[PDB]
């Protein structure tokens, strides 16, 4: 049931918990460099429903795009 709880929590993006987490993680991704390798998926339920499996040979890269 755990992934269902994470899924509902990540749909509640304007809650105070999620807006705190999003702001602090946005701050630290801003402090990192533009193309970066993550050591693990930040959103594991989203990653697995998009195809990721916790095996050797699946890697995760964080990319920053200048928006507009």
């Amino acid at each position: 049931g755990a992934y269902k709880y994470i899924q509902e929590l990540w749909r509640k993006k304007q809650s105070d918990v999620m807006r705190f987490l999003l702001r602090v993680r946005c701050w630290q991704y801003r402090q990192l460099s533009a193309l970066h390798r993550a050591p693990r998926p930040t959103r594991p339920d989203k990653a697995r429903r998009l195809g990721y499996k916790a095996k050797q040979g699946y890697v995760i890269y964080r990319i920053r795009v200048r928006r507009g």
């Binding site: 049931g1 755990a2 709880y5 999620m18 705190f20 602090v24 630290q28 402090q31």
Partner: protein, 241 residues
């Protein structure tokens, strides 16, 4: 008594413009690498900002002596490793070969790890106790778990150490661990620890749920405002009376 007259105390003074500075400790003023600056400023940020109660509850961890007592209890019921497991399988195979037969022989109680597993256990009221690590670094895999264990009425505790959980379950890290039913000689150890944990966590959940966190200023800022408050009080106490 026979000391040499050629030896002499020759001190050096380290005033400004005088003899050059000694290699004193510089560890506060180091140009640190950016990952060190990032983790230090992340810790500072958490303390500075207003942290919601669903994360403050994970800040409120357990007392050390009860934590060690719980670990002793968990070490009594830790899962088995691969080598002792295969020894158990070969022993089962040889006793099945000769000669008493199927013999399930009362499959022992064991700890149950993993957030999906314990979410099912809490949801169907199977667990006697839930223990959750305080430093899950993506802290949103567990922020629903205290409310869930509260509503189901299962006692849960926030332990201080994810690696400590992982080491008792023979891996690197582990998020949560559930206690199911236990043998008779440790039922009394439970029958003290469970109401200790329940009085620490479940009975004061509303206070926990409304108690906010963070929002403390830096040492320089609190020193400056304390200077201003005492610099007003030191003459207001003389104006009064």
């Amino acid at each position: 008594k026979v000391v040499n007259p050629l030896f002499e105390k020759r001190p050096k003074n380290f005033g400004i413009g005088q003899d050059i500075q000694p290699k004193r400790d510089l560890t506060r003023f180091v140009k640190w690498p950016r990952y060190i600056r990032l983790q230090r400023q992340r810790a500072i940020l958490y303390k500075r900002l207003k942290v919601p109660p669903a994360i403050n509850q994970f800040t409120q961890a357990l007392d050390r002596q009860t934590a060690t007592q719980l670990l002793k209890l968990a070490h009594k019921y830790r899962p088995e490793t691969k080598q002792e497991k295969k020894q158990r399988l070969l022993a089962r195979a040889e006793k099945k070969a000769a000669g008493k037969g199927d013999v399930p022989t009362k499959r022992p109680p064991v700890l149950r790890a993993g957030v999906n597993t314990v979410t099912t256990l809490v949801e169907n009221k199977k667990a006697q106790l839930v223990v959750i690590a305080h430093d899950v670094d993506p802290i949103e895999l567990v922020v629903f778990l205290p409310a869930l264990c509260r509503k189901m009425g299962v006692p849960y505790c926030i332990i201080k150490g994810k690696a400590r959980l992982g080491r008792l379950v023979h891996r690197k890290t582990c998020t949560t661990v559930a206690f199911t039913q236990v043998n008779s000689e440790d039922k009394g150890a439970l029958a003290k620890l469970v109401e200790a944990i329940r009085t620490n966590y479940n009975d004061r959940y509303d206070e926990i749920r409304r108690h906010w966190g963070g929002n403390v200023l830096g040492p320089k800022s609190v020193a400056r405002i304390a200077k201003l408050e005492k610099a007003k009080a030191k003459e207001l106490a003389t104006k009064l009376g």
